[PDB]
Design a protein around this ligand. Sequence first.
Ligand SMILES: OC[C@H]1O[C@@H](O[C@H]2[C@H](O)[C@H](O)[C@H](O[C@H]3[C@H](O)[C@H](O)[C@H](O[C@H]4[C@H](O)[C@H](O)[C@H](O[C@H]5[C@H](O)[C@H](O)[C@H](O[C@H]6[C@H](O)[C@H](O)[C@H](O)O[C@@H]6CO)O[C@@H]5CO)O[C@@H]4CO)O[C@@H]3CO)O[C@@H]2CO)[C@@H](O)[C@@H](O)[C@@H]1O
Length: 159
Amino acid sequence: ADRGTETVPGLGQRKQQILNSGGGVWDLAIAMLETKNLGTDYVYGDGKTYDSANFGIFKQNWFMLRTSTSQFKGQTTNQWNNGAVLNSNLQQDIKARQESQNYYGPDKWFAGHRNGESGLSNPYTQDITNYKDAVNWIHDQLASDPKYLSDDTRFWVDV
Ligand SMILES: OC[C@H]1O[C@@H](O[C@H]2[C@H](O)[C@H](O)[C@H](O[C@H]3[C@H](O)[C@H](O)[C@H](O[C@H]4[C@H](O)[C@H](O)[C@H](O[C@H]5[C@H](O)[C@H](O)[C@H](O[C@H]6[C@H](O)[C@H](O)[C@H](O)O[C@@H]6CO)O[C@@H]5CO)O[C@@H]4CO)O[C@@H]3CO)O[C@@H]2CO)[C@@H](O)[C@@H](O)[C@@H]1O
């Protein structure tokens, strides 16, 4: 099976931090696909650098951060280490992602989040659509019972 459930100690505390730090159920769904622990403690930049570098609980990339958020408006590729603040500031992390999606719109945001600058030029590939559909499924699972907003259940999808 390409999707399912698992129980992760501490997840509910993370879900409630997200929902109490400006996040909605939609942000939770994206974050839940990004990491198992709703955390930022994957390797720095997810092992990537400059525009590809991933930061925050959604693993937003620096290209998206510098082009579409008020926190990083107008910054350069070389300034990519400036995104690291999102690894410790959840409020700004969520606000950045929400702003990013409002700048690009959901379609474009999905493409540029999933595939960087290249995704903006081809936003409806099968891979981006699959990622979109997985996030939608996870959101549907979380929305199906309020207990999933505070328990330790993770809904995962293999994209
Ligand atoms: O413009 C700059 C250049 O950008 C390039 O594009 C980049 C882009 O900049 C950015 O770096 C982007 O980064 C992606 C990244 O590639 C990746 O997709 C990432 O998404 C992850 C996350 O890292 C984890 O890998 C996560 O893993 C979860 C699994 O999906 C799954 O849910 C799993 O569940 C399992 C379960 O736990 C249990 O074990 C069960 O038994 O089995 C299940 C199945 O495994 O749990 C995992 C979590 O632990 O998946 C997500 C999603 O895939 O997110 C970012 C996107 O934000 O990459 C692109 C490059 O592709 C280019 O455009 C370049 O041209 C530019 O110059």
